Paper text:
Next, L-β-aspartyl-4-phosphate is reduced to L-aspartate-beta-semialdehyde (ASA) catalyzed by aspartate semialdehyde dehydrogenase. This is followed by a Schiff base formation with pyruvate and addition of ASA to form (4S)-4-hydroxy-2,3,4,5-tetrahydro-(2S)-dipicolinate (HTPA) catalyzed by dihydrodipicolinate synthase (Mtb-DapA)8. Mtb-DapA belongs to the subfamily of N-acetylneuraminate lyase (α/β)8 proteins. It contains an N-terminal (α/β)8 TIM barrel catalytic core and an α-helical C-terminal domain19. The active site residues Thr54, Thr55, Tyr143, Arg148 and Lys171 of Mtb-DapA are largely conserved among its homologues.
The structure of Mtb-rDapA in complex with α-KPA was solved at 2.4 Å resolution. The Mtb-rDapA-α-KPA complex structure comprises a monomer of the polypeptide in P42212 space group. Hence, the residue Tyr117 that completes the catalytic triad could not be located closer to the active site. The structure reveals the presence of α-KPA at hydrogen bonding distance from the residues Thr54, Tyr143 and Lys171. In addition, α-KPA also forms hydrogen bonding interactions with Thr55, Arg148 and Gly194. Alpha-KPA occupies the position of the substrate pyruvate and thus could prevent the formation of a Schiff base with pyruvate, which is the first step of the ping-pong reaction. The Mtb-DapA and Mtb-rDapA-α-KPA complexed structures superpose very well with an RMSD of 0.3 Å, indicating an apparent lack of conformational changes in the protein upon ligand binding. The proportion of inhibition measured at different concentrations of the analogues showed that the IC50 for α-KPA was 21 μM and the inhibition constant Ki was 32.5 μM at 500 μM pyruvate and 400 μM ASA. The IC50 of Mtb-rDapA pre-incubated with pyruvate was 160 μM, which is nearly 8 fold higher compared to pre-incubation with α-KPA. These results suggest that α-KPA competes with pyruvate for a binding site in Mtb-rDapA. Our results show that α-KPA disrupts the oligomerization of Mtb-rDapA thereby causing loss of enzyme activity.
Numbering used by the authors:
A (entry chain A), B (entry chain A), C (entry chain A), D (entry chain A): 4 to 300
Write the structure that this text describes.
C-alpha cells in the first residue's frame, strides 16, 4: 500500500542452518560468523529457523535465542526473517509473537505438515497467524514436505490480508504463481534453487536459497544479470551453480549446507537427529560438485 | 521370544481422538467415557495421542495427562498404547520415557514427518527411540503424511531390535508387508480401515482403526469371522462399514470421528486448529453414511 | 442374468506371451505348446494379445492368426479371451468383431492409453466396443500404463451393459473394487499378481496372471485353498510365489515371462522392440527367485 | 556440425490438429487452410500427426495423405515436421521412412507409451528410428502420457546420434533440460505452453505449441520480446495467453484446439473417439478464456 517486499525482506535470502556445538548445543557464536559471512557474500536478507535451519529439532527458546544472535550481528545491514510455522496453530501464534517481540523483520509461516488439514483450515490457520503480528508474513508452500498444497484459491483469499505479503514457493507451479503475482501482487521467492531462473522469468522477487550457503556471490550476480536484462549471463551463472543443485538432490539441504560449509573452512557442526551428517562418500561427491561450481579449492 | 503382540497390544485398537472441552481445554472426563465406551464396544486396546488423537496440537503435559486418564479408566481390561513420535529424536526420547513412567503398555512411533530424513537417519531415530524404554514399540509407516516411507530394508534392520515388535502400516504395500511378516515375524496392524480385510488376508494381527470410533462392534465381528474361517461374513461386514470409509476419505479421521461421535450422542468437542470441525453439509453426508452402516438412527 | 463369469471366462487365466521365432516372426507352434502347457498346469482360461502378449508390437493379422492357433489347441478344454483394446475406438471395433468371427470366448478391452481421454469419452468408447459383439467383455483398468483410470462412476455406468461382465483390475483400489462387486455384481480379476490374495478377500473371481507362466500349479492351489476356507495355506502359497512377483517388479511381465519360460525348457523367443530380453545378470537374478519359488532346478 | 535447429525445424511450431470432415473422414482441404492460417499468423514450422493431431486414431495412409497436403500448402515458407512415433519400433521405422519419402523436413518421435519399456529398450528404439532416415529427429519426452520418462542418461547417450538434434519436453524438468542443453547442445522445444517462458529462460529454441492454434501471433511476439531482451513484455504476453493454458488444463489439447478453432470461424470438425468434442458448458468456458486472451469477439 505500497509495501516494498524487495526492501522489507530482501532479494537474496539464505535459509540459514542453525549451527550446533560439538556436543549438540546451540552455537550462537558460529551463527553470527555465518550470518556476517552470508551478508558479506551478497545476501541482503536471512531466514532463521526455516526448514534448512532444522526448525523441527530446535526448542522455542533456542529459536528466540538464535533470532537475537542474528539480529545483533547483521540486523543493521540485512533483513532477518524468522520462521514461525508448525502444524499447531496456537503454537505458531506464540512463536510469531515472541519473534515479533525480539524485533525480527518478517515472518515465514510454512503450511502445517503431517496432519493434512483441509484448505479452509489452512486459511483459518494463516489468518490467525497473520493476525498475531503486524510483521510482513510470507506464505511457505511446500506440499512435497507438508503433504498438502496451498491451493491457488487459498492463496488469493489470503492475499487480501495486509500482513501476508508474499509466497515462498517450493511447489514449482510456475504457471499458477505467475498468475497469482500478476493478479494479487504478492511477492514470490524461489524456494527451489533448481528453479531460481525460471522463477525470475515468472516475475519472482528473489531467492530464499539453500545453495547460497556456498555460492551466494554467484546467485547475487545471477539476480543482477537478470535484472539488467542480460539473460545469457544469468543462464551462464545458473549452469555454473547447477552441480550444487544436484548435490542438494542427493543430500537434502540440511546435510548439504553443513557438510559444504565445513569444506569451505566454516565448520557449523552436524545436524540434529533424525537428520544425519554426510558420509565420507557423500562428502567427496559434494566436493566434486563444489569444485565444478568453483566454490572449493 | 516368544512375545505375543496380540495379547500385549491388542487385536482391535482405536486410535482415540483427544476430547476437548467447549473452550478447547483437554477434557479428561470425556476421554474416560469414550475409553470405556470403545472397550465396552469390542476394543481390547487403545492408542492415545496418535494421528487421530491430534498429537500435533497437544502439549507434552496434556499427552501424559491424557495417558493416565485412559489408564485408570480402562487399563485393567484393555491395553493402552501411547504415541511417542515426532520429527525430533530427542523429544521422542523424552516422550517415550515419560509415557513409560506413567505405565503405558506400548509405544507407537511415527516416521519423522516434514523434514524427510534419509533412511539411515530413520533407522538411527527408531533405534534411539526403542532404546529409551523396554516397552514394546510399534513402527508407524505412513508416507502419505510424513513424506518418507520406511523402506523394507529399514524395517527388516529394525526388526532385530527386541523392543520393536510390529508395524502399523498406512503405506498399503501389502506384498511387502506380507513378506516382512513371514520373514521377520513382526506383527502388522492395518493403519488403513479401507484395507482392513486385505491386511487380514496378508496375515495382519489387527486394526489400529479410526472408524472403530463408530463401528467397533462390527469390526470385532469382522476379526472374529475372519479368524473363524468365515471369509464371506467378514466381507459382508466390510461392505457394511464401507460407507464410513468413504466418509473418512471426504473428511479425514479427526473431523470424522469427532463429528460422528456427536451424532452418536457422545459429544467429544471440536478439533484444534489447523483442523476444523465438520460443516453442516459434511455432517449430513456423514450421517447418511452412518445410517448406511447401521450405526445411526 | 444369470451369467457365470467363472465358467464363461475362467478362474485361473494366464495373459499369454506371444511367442516369436528366432527371426522375430509369429511362432504359432510354440504358442500351442505353451497353451497346452498352461492349461495342463492348472489354467482353465487364457488371454491372448494382452499387455504381456506384446499387443503393442503385433499386427491385426498376427493377432487373429494367434487366436485360432490357441483356440484349436486348447479351446475345447479351456476358455480363450482375446484382447481387443487400443487407443483407437474404430480400430477396437474391427478387432473385437474379427476376434468374434474367429470364435474367441471373450473380449478384454484395455483403457485407451497415451491420449488421456476424459471419462465420458471412455464410457462412449467401451459402450461402442461392447456393442460390436455379443461376447462377454472384460474391462481392463490399468492407469499406471494408460495414464487414465476408469473412475468408479464410469465402471458403474458401464456395468448395466449386458456384454460388460467384469473388470481386470490393475489399479489396486481394493476398497472401490469391493464396493463395485457388491453393488453391481461385476466379476473382478486380479491384474496384479502381488495382490492376488487381497483381491480374493475382496471377492475377486480369479487371476488374469503373469507369474502363472511359471507357477500356474501353485496359483491353482492358492485359489483352491482360499475357496475351501483354508486361508493359511493360500497365504503360505502366496509367500512361496512372492519371489516371482519381485522379479516381475524388476523386469516387467514381458521380459520376465519369456526369460523365465526359457529357463523352464520352454523357449518362446525374445520380445519385440521397444521391449528387450533379459540381460545375463537379470537372468541369474530371475533364476534365484525361481529357485526360491521351487519352479526351477 | 553446425546444424541450425532454429532454421531446420523452426522456432514457433504448432502441433496441428488433424481436421476431419463432418462424417469423420480426413479433410485435406481444411488442413491446408489451417496450415496457411497458422503460418500467416506467425508459425515458421508445423508438426503434423503429433499428440494434438490425433495420431492414435489416424491410419498410416491418412498420415502420409495429410503430410503431402501440408507440404504442398506451406512447405515453401514453413518447416513441416511429421510425428513418427508409436509403441512399435518396426512400425515407427516404416512411418519415418514413408514420411521421409514424402519430403517431410523433420521427425518427431514420442517415447513408446503404455508398454513401459526399460531405458535400454528406449535407447535401442530411438537409435533404430534415427537410423531409418537422415532427417533431423526430435525426441519427445512426455512421461505423463507415455508412463516412462527418457532419463537424462538416455538423452545424453542419444545426443551423439547425428540425426537426433533436440528434445520436445513435456516433462517440465527445467533443471535437467538446462544442463542437457548446455552439455550436449541439443535444441529444446517447450512441449508445455504453461512453461513456454520458463523454457526460454532455460535456453529453449522455441515452442511446439497447442494454444498457438488460437494465439500464434502473441506467442510470436513473446519469442520476439524475449530474444530482444525485453523480458517484461514476454511476461506481459504470457499473462495475456494464460487463460488459454487454463482452458487446455480443463479440456486437453485436442478438444481445446478443435472447439477453439470453430469459435474463431475456422471449423475443423470434431475429434475421433475415444476423444470427444467440447460440451456447451465447456464451449462457453473456453470462450470466456479466449475473450480474456483477446482472441475472440
Ligand atoms: O529443499 C527443500 O525442501 C527446502 C528448500 C527451501 C529452503 C527454505 C527453507 O529451508 O525454509
Ligand atoms: O488416515 C490416516 O492418515 C490415519 C489413519 C491411521 C490411524 C492411526 C493413527 O491415527 O495413529
Ligand atoms: O504388470 C502389468 O502392468 C500387467 C499385469 C497384468 C497382466 C494382464 C495383461 O497383460 O493383459
Ligand atoms: O498437453 C499435452 O500432453 C501435449 C502438449 C504438447 C503438444 C505436442 C504434441 O501434441 O505433439
Ligand atoms: Na495447489
Ligand atoms: Na483452489
Ligand atoms: Na517403501
Ligand atoms: Na529398502
Ligand atoms: Na479411479
Ligand atoms: Na467417479
Ligand atoms: Na527422467
Ligand atoms: Na538417468
Amino acid at each position: 500500500v505500497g509495501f516494498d517486499v524487495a526492501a522489507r525482506l530482501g532479494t537474496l535470502l539464505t535459509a540459514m542452518v542453525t549451527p550446533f556445538s560439538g556436543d549438540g548445543s546451540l552455537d550462537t557464536a558460529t551463527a553470527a560468523r555465518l550470518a556476517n559471512h552470508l551478508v558479506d557474500q551478497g545476501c541482503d536478507g536471512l531466514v532463521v529457523s526455516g526448514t534448512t535451519g532444522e526448525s523441527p529439532t530446535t526448542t522455542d527458546g533456542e529459536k528466540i535465542e538464535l533470532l537475537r544472535a542474528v539480529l545483533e550481528a547483521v540486523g543493521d545491514r540485512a533483513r532477518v526473517i524468522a520462521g514461525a510455522g508448525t502444524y499447531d496453530t496456537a503454537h505458531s501464534i506464540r512463536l510469531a509473537k515472541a519473534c515479533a517481540a525480539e524485533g525480527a523483520h518478517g515472518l515465514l509461516v510454512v503450511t502445517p505438515y503431517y496432519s493434512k488439514p483441509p484448505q479452509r483450515g489452512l486459511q483459518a490457520h494463516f489468518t490467525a497467524v497473520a493476525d498475531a503480528t503486524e510483521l510482513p508474513m510470507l506464505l511457505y508452500d511446500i506440499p512435497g514436505r507438508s503433504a498438502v498444497p496451498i491451493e491457488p484459491d487459498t492463496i488469493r483469499a489470503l492475499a487480501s490480508h495486509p500482513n501476508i505479503v508474499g509466497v515462498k514457493d517450493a511447489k514449482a507451479d510456475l504457471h499458477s504463481g505467475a498468475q497469482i503475482m500478476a493478479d494479487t501482487g504478492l511477492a514470490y521467492y524461489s524456494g527451489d534453487d533448481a528453479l531460481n531462473l525460471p522463477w525470475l522469468a515468472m516475475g519472482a522477487t528473489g531467492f530464499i536459497s539453500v545453495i547460497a550457503h556456498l555460492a551466494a556471490g554467484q546467485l547475487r550476480e545471477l539476480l543482477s544479470a537478470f535484472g539488467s536484462g542480460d539473460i545469457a549471463t544469468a543462464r551462464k551463472i545458473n549452469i555454473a551453480v547447477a552441480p550444487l543443485c544436484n548435490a542438494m538432490s542427493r543430500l537434502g539441504g540440511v546435510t548439504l549446507s553443513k557438510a559444504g560449509l565445513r569444506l569451505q573452512g566454516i565448520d557449523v557442526g552436524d545436524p540434529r537427529l533424525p537428520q544425519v551428517a554426510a558420509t565420507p562418500e557423500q562428502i567427496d561427491a559434494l566436493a566434486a560438485d563444489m569444485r565444478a561450481a568453483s566454490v572449493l579449492r
